[PDB]
Amino acid sequence: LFQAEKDRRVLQMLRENLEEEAIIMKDVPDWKVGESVFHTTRWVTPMMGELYGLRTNEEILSATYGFIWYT
Amino acid sequence: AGRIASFLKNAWAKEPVLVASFAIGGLAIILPSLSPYTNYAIRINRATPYNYPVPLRDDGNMPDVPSHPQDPQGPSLEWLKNL
Amino acid sequence: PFFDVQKRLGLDLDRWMTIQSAEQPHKIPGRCHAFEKEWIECAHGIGGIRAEKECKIEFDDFVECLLRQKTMKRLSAIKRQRDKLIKEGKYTPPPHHLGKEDPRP
Amino acid sequence: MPLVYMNIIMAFAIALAGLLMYRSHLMSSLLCLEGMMLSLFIMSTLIILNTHFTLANMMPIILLVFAACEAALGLSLLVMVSNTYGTDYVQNLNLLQC
Amino acid sequence: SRGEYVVAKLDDLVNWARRSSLWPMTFGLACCAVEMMHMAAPRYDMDRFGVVFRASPRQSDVMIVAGTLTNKMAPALRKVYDQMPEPRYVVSMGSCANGGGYYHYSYSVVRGCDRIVPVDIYVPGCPPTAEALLYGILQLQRKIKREKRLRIWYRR
Amino acid sequence: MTMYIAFILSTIFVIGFVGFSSKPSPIYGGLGLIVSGGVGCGIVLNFGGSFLGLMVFLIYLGGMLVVFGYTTAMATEMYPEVWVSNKTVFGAFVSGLMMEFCMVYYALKEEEVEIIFKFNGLGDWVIYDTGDSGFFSEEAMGIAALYSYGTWLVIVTGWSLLIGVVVIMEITRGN
Amino acid sequence: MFMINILSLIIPILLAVAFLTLVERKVLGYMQLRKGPNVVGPYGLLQPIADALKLFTKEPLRPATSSISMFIIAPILALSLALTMWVPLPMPYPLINMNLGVLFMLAMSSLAVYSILWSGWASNSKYALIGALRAVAQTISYEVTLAIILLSVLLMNGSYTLSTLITTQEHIWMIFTSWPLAMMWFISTLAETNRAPFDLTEGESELVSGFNVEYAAGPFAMFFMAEYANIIMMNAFTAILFLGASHDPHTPELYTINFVLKTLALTITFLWIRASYPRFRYDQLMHLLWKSFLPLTLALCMWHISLPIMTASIPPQS
Amino acid sequence: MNIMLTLLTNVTLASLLVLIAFWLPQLNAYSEKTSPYECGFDPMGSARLPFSMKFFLVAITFLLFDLEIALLLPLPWASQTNNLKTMLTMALFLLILLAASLAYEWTQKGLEWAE
Amino acid sequence: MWFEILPGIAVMAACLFIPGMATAHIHKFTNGGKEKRVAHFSYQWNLMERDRRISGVNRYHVTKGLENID
Numbered sequence A: 001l002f003q004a005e006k007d008r009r010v011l012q013m014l015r016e017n018l019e020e021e022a023i024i025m026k027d028v029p030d031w032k033v034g035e036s037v038f039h040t041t042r043w044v045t046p047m048m049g050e051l052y053g054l055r056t057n058e059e060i061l062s063a064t065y066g067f068i069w070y071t
Numbered sequence B: 001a002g003r004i005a006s007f008l009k010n011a012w013a014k015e016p017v018l019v020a021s022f023a024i025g026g027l028a029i030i031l032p033s034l035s036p037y038t039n040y041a042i043r044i045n046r047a048t049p050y051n052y053p054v055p056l057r058d059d060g061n062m063p064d065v066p067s068h069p070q071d072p073q074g075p076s077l078e079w080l081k082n083l
Numbered sequence C: 001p002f003f004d005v006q007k008r009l010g011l012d013l014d015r016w017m018t019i020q021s022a023e024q025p026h027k028i029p030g031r032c033h034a035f036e037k038e039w040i041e042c043a044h045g046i047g048g049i050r051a052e053k054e055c056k057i058e059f060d061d062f063v064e065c066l067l068r069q070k071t072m073k074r075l076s077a078i079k080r081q082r083d084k085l086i087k088e089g090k091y092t093p094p095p096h097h098l099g100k101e102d103p104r105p
Numbered sequence D: 001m002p003l004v005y006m007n008i009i010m011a012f013a014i015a016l017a018g019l020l021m022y023r024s025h026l027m028s029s030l031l032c033l034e035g036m037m038l039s040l041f042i043m044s045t046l047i048i049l050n051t052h053f054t055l056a057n058m059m060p061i062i063l064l065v066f067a068a069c070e071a072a073l074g075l076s077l078l079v080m081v082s083n084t085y086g087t088d089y090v091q092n093l094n095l096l097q098c
Numbered sequence E: 001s002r003g004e005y006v007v008a009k010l011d012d013l014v015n016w017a018r019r020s021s022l023w024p025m026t027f028g029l030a031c032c033a034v035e036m037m038h039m040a041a042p043r044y045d046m047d048r049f050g051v052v053f054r055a056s057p058r059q060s061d062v063m064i065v066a067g068t069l070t071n072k073m074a075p076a077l078r079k080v081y082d083q084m085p086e087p088r089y090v091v092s093m094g095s096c097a098n099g100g101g102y103y104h105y106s107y108s109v110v111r112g113c114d115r116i117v118p119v120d121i122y123v124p125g126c127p128p129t130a131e132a133l134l135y136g137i138l139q140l141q142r143k144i145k146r147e148k149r150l151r152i153w154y155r156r
Numbered sequence F: 001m002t003m004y005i006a007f008i009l010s011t012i013f014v015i016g017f018v019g020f021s022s023k024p025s026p027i028y029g030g031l032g033l034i035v036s037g038g039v040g041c042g043i044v045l046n047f048g049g050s051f052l053g054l055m056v057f058l059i060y061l062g063g064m065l066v067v068f069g070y071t072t073a074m075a076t077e078m079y080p081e082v083w084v085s086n087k088t089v090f091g092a093f094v095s096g097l098m099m100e101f102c103m104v105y106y107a108l109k110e111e112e113v114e115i116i117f118k119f120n121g122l123g124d125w126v127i128y129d130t131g132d133s134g135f136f137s138e139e140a141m142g143i144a145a146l147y148s149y150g151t152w153l154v155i156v157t158g159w160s161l162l163i164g165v166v167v168i169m170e171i172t173r174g175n
Numbered sequence G: 001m002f003m004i005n006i007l008s009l010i011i012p013i014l015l016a017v018a019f020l021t022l023v024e025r026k027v028l029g030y031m032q033l034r035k036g037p038n039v040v041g042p043y044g045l046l047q048p049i050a051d052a053l054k055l056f057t058k059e060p061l062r063p064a065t066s067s068i069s070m071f072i073i074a075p076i077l078a079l080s081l082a083l084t085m086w087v088p089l090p091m092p093y094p095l096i097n098m099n100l101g102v103l104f105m106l107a108m109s110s111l112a113v114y115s116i117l118w119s120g121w122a123s124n125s126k127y128a129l130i131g132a133l134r135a136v137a138q139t140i141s142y143e144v145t146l147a148i149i150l151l152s153v154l155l156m157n158g159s160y161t162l163s164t165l166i167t168t169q170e171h172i173w174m175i176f177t178s179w180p181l182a183m184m185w186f187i188s189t190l191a192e193t194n195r196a197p198f199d200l201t202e203g204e205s206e207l208v209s210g211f212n213v214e215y216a217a218g219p220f221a222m223f224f225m226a227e228y229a230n231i232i233m234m235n236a237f238t239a240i241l242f243l244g245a246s247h248d249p250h251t252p253e254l255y256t257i258n259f260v261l262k263t264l265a266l267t268i269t270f271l272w273i274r275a276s277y278p279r280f281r282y283d284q285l286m287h288l289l290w291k292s293f294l295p296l297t298l299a300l301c302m303w304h305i306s307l308p309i310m311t312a313s314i315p316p317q318s
Numbered sequence H: 001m002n003i004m005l006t007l008l009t010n011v012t013l014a015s016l017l018v019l020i021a022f023w024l025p026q027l028n029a030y031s032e033k034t035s036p037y038e039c040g041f042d043p044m045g046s047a048r049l050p051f052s053m054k055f056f057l058v059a060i061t062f063l064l065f066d067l068e069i070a071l072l073l074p075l076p077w078a079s080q081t082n083n084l085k086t087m088l089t090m091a092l093f094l095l096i097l098l099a100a101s102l103a104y105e106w107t108q109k110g111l112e113w114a115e
Numbered sequence I: 001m002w003f004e005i006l007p008g009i010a011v012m013a014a015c016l017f018i019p020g021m022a023t024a025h026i027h028k029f030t031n032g033g034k035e036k037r038v039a040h041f042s043y044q045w046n047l048m049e050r051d052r053r054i055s056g057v058n059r060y061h062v063t064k065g066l067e068n069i070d
């Protein structure tokens, strides 16, 4: 159940980032929305910055240092 | 026989700490090879499920793989409960 | 120079530690396990000279996984454009990107 | 690369420069050697932690072990040097020329 | 006046603290020190008053001059007195420290430690009994209790 | 961007390295190395290396106690030097400080390749992994694997330690 | 609300430390056929307050030959470390819950010695230098044996988490399984806190005052506070390590009372030992630790590694 | 985050105590009060002169013995491996070599202080 | 006493009672009264984060039972 929820949450975050990027970067002439940086077409586990790039600093802090700093 | 007896007596009279240390170290080296519970310790270590058991794709030729955890097939920790 | 005693005797003195995709304890995977696996299987048995050219795509993907330079560049470009559009007031971030989202498990 | 990687590499460069430029005391150069080892430990630990290379987690510890040996080695030599001269100044080690 | 009352109460507090915790230096010269050792003995138990010997002059409050002070020793006594941080007190114990005593007319004896350091209490005797020394320390406690440093500062 | 705690820690690391590399009296060099060890422990703790950081701090504390004793024995002078008691020491300290300042400025203000490569900074938090599983610590497992995977490493390390004891005894014999 | 918890941890420890001095003076007195402080307040209950007020209203002095920065830094380091080392202790809950609390405590202990070392060196006096070198020798004497004893004892716990020590000793005290090591551990604590018969860094009868001879008033009081706090803290650690109190999740005050009583018993045992014995020579301490404690410690480490495998009694939580 | 706050609080309290101790009382500093202490007299030499270490060899050996602690600390986690025989063999071998080092230095008079 | 040593000891004991007890009470006050959660491993932290996300008030200790499955 945790696995299914994690997949849904990650995919939702990535889709939200995709839509925001599509809205934001409409003016740049040679930019493809959602273009990958890998030649391979297989699934790549998202990096922290990709998931939390366009969010608040508090969410980023909780995502990065939340577990380590919890005591 | 007698030479070792005299040497051990002199050591026990002069250096009891060293005698005890060597005895404890020798016992620690020797005893594990003669114990029947070392195998039990290994099996207890193997029986701890740290990661998820990934199921196998059924192909109709595995009589010894359960289709449900409560099925009789597979390993059993009945020995562990009484241990 | 390199007397391969390990290969002659079949000992594995230090080959268990040479690569990231090789039998970690508890089956804990490396961050770039798939990319390294792809590159190693591409380059196996063809020699270094041919592997440098014919397996350059796999190695580039592996290095991108390792260091994430291109991903950081893309994220920086997106954030720079977002800041530029926000300073002139043409763009507004959505509520879920401002801390007022509806969380899900 | 993160800015932390650059800071650690700069720390190694500073320690190497401090070792290569000698003042009088040999103990200072030994301390520069120890600092170089510490920076190497930090750099390797950060790389191995970031890449999640599990079996490499024992690599830094081994480094420390041999660092100790090197440290001990240096101190041993220092003692003898002092015993000859009453001082650890490197300018007394000039009996041999090129 | 509120300020006068405040400074009086603060004077009371600091005087109580300083007289309830008196740490003399571990310092004795002659027979008198033996009687001093009998004041720390169980019968009198000077520690029960809060009086504890401390070897370091930096950590001590009181100089008890228990014994004859010679000319060869006077610079050392003055040095370890000067190295006592303030506030500091000196108790002269016995005839030799008070005025020279039995060796007053000698060529090598200082005729009283008050030629070298200021003295707060003079304890007579040759030697004073441990009880007489205890009386001297209690009198010094009373004298410290009579101090009005903060009131004097306020009235300046 | 998030509070740049790791950047501040690494900057203090570099400052301590400059402190002991300008080579004042070995007392202050040892102090600087102790500070650098503690701060590097903090960095590794922030990246998830609890055991490794704590161990490096402990090891360097013991080594620096030995170094302090040896400095008082055979590395002293009438007037031990501080970072401001010497033109050479102060010059080296200042040069290291401004060199770190220049490197940092050329790093976070623009993308330039100093020696090896270039980058933008952006704080370490970006390059993490968001791995979500486990009832253990991967660092502890990898370190504990030394007794099951690294038999060869244990053998060579123990041999080197015994040989090092023999070696120091041979060296300090004199005669 | 976490700052409230920090204050509720640190202030009572200082208050406890102040009263500890009064108890030692009285315990020493009654063991020496006298009374100890019984005049300043009822039963001398106001004596620590008077001592503190006297010490903090006295003039501190900077030695002319001293190195001012290190001279000031050393007492701050000592007191701050003494306060810090209490945060992972489970009573039965810790202020800071660490996976590796024992290793953190070891590292902070190792760092605490540098307060003594730097105070002795920066005092720029001969007796202070002798005291600092004695501290170096003491650390070299006890460190490795202490660490190996900790490892051997914790092999039965399964991890370095302090709170797990409560679960390990749920039915029996760990001492009943490791009473030999415990004795050695006790002695190591006496050497770790510079307590008699191993009070060599100060060494009043030999070095006047040792490392802190040049310190007066407030910094000296801070050194004293740090030392007594370390005494109480190490006895609390020993009580947690070897005498496991039974913990009720719904009644943690029972555990707190049990733990405090055991800690007070161990501290009073320290005071008793100070009252009973002469002082070691600081070379004899190193010979004792390296020629008697180390071989037994190594043999017992070997035995305690082999024992859980032999009996199939390996604890959980890899 | 909490540990940083605790460390800051402890250091701040100690520093504030030092500040109180140095700024509250009345100070009267003169050259005789601040002179070095040698129990009655001026020291003959400097305290910065070399001070011989008679236990230098034991001090060096402490460096090598301090890393055996690093090697032996992961033993509780190593005890959870499946191949307990190899782990036990390696741990016992490491401790045996440590004991052999101690014995070698002991028999070669390496634990005796210099005269 | 010799029992005159007891009062000071008692004071010390009272002081040593304060920290742990306080911690317990504080741990109950800021965690819904139910023994602050321990997260030594990332699985426990993930459980806590999921609890906070599904609490509806950004507080992990607000527990949702079977009344939340309508």
Ligand SMILES: CCCCCCCCCCCCCCCCC[C@@H](O)O[C@H](CO[C@H](O)CCCCCCCCCCCCCCC)COP(=O)(O)OCC[N+](C)(C)C
Residues within 6 Å of the ligand: E009, E010, E012, E013, E016, G039, G041, G046, G049, G053
């Ligand atoms: C909170 C942290 C900051 C402050 C730190 C200090 C805390 C305050 C100190 C505690 C005060 C208690 C001391 C009072 C004890 C007096 C007991 C009695 O004996 O005193 C008598 C009278 O009292 C004294 O005259 C005055 C002492 C009372 C002090 C005045 C109260 C001021 C309190 C203000 C506190 C403010 C602190 C700083 C705030 C910023 C004189 O009797 P004495 O001659 O000795 O004994 C003779 C011996 N016999 C009995 C055997 C025959």
Ligand SMILES: CCCCCCCCCCCCCCCCC[C@@H](O)O[C@H](CO[C@H](O)CCCCCCCCCCCCCCC)COP(=O)(O)OCC[N+](C)(C)C
Residues within 6 Å of the ligand: C013, C023, F148, F149, F151, F152, F155, F159, H083, H086, H089, H093
């Ligand atoms: C050719 C001449 C031979 C004699 C001289 C050789 C000189 C070199 C010294 C010894 C040679 C090293 C060979 C041992 C390599 C270790 C690997 C191999 O032996 O397997 C180990 C078998 O274990 C053995 O017990 C190794 C221990 C034997 C060595 C201990 C004592 C010998 C040391 C002698 C020289 C050292 C210095 C001097 C000491 C006095 C572990 O394998 P295992 O655990 O199954 O599975 C691991 C894979 N997993 C993780 C996926 C499960």
Ligand SMILES: CCCCCCCCCCCCCCCCC[C@@H](O)O[C@H](CO[C@H](O)CCCCCCCCCCCCCCC)COP(=O)(O)OCC[N+](C)(C)C
Residues within 6 Å of the ligand: H016, H017, H019, H020, H023, H024, H025, H026, H027
């Ligand atoms: C227990 C932990 C909690 C403690 C909390 C309190 C922390 C206290 C920290 C230290 C304070 C205790 C010291 C006692 C009072 C301070 C007096 C000193 O620090 O300042 C004096 C102030 O002197 C200054 O040099 C002159 C004052 C002018 C400078 C002030 C700058 C701004 C004032 C401008 C006037 C307009 C008002 C602006 C503010 C609103 C200097 O006196 P000085 O003689 O050297 O030193 C000896 C002090 N004696 C006499 C008490 C022994």
Ligand SMILES: CCCCCCCC/C=C\CCCCCCCC(=O)O[C@H](COC(=O)CCCCCCC/C=C/CCCCCCCC)COP(=O)(O)OCCN
Residues within 6 Å of the ligand: B008, B011, B014, B015, B018, B019, B020, B021, B022, B023, B024, B025, B026, B029, G291, G294, G295, G296, G298, G299, H096, H099, H102, H103, H106, H107
């Ligand atoms: C097979 C076990 C191996 C592993 C276990 C060992 C664990 C650790 C123990 C070894 C640690 C190092 C030991 C170092 C030995 C050095 C011996 C030595 O030279 O010391 C002699 C002292 O000892 C000797 O006399 C030489 C050896 C004496 C015998 C010691 C024990 C030998 C073996 C006896 C035990 C056998 C096993 C027990 C059997 C039980 C009986 C049925 C000199 O003493 P000083 O301090 O210099 O004297 C100064 C004051 N006069």
Ligand SMILES: CCCCCCCC/C=C\CCCCCCCC(=O)O[C@H](COC(=O)CCCCCCC/C=C/CCCCCCCC)COP(=O)(O)OCCN
Residues within 6 Å of the ligand: B014, B015, B017, B020, B024, G180, G181, G182, G183, G184, G186, G187, G190, G197, G238, G242, G273, G288, G292, G293, G296, G303
């Ligand atoms: C079947 C397998 C079982 C495993 C084996 C178990 C049996 C173990 C048998 C031996 C156990 C001995 C444990 C003690 C370890 C050290 C003992 C020792 O011999 O040390 C002494 C010295 O030890 C001391 O005297 C200690 C001095 C410090 C005294 C300080 C106070 C004493 C403490 C009093 C109460 C102790 C309470 C400890 C436990 C408290 C609870 C935690 C050696 O020194 P010397 O006599 O001078 O001779 C050296 C040259 N041959």
Ligand SMILES: CCCCCCCCCCC1=C(C)C(=O)C(OC)=C(OC)C1=O
Residues within 6 Å of the ligand: E026, E027, E028, E029, E030, E031, E032, E033, E034, E036, E037, E040, E053
């Ligand atoms: C702490 C137990 C009581 C100790 C009292 C310390 C007294 C210090 C005086 C110095 C002294 C000592 C030590 C001393 O032992 C002695 O006898 C020869 C003297 O001559 C009478 C002395 O003056």
Ligand code: SF4
Residues within 6 Å of the ligand: E030, E031, E032, E033, E066, E067, E068, E093, E094, E095, E096, E097, E101, E102, E125, E126, E127, E128
């Ligand atoms: S006064 Fe009498 S008892 Fe005291 S020191 Fe002089 S001669 Fe001795």
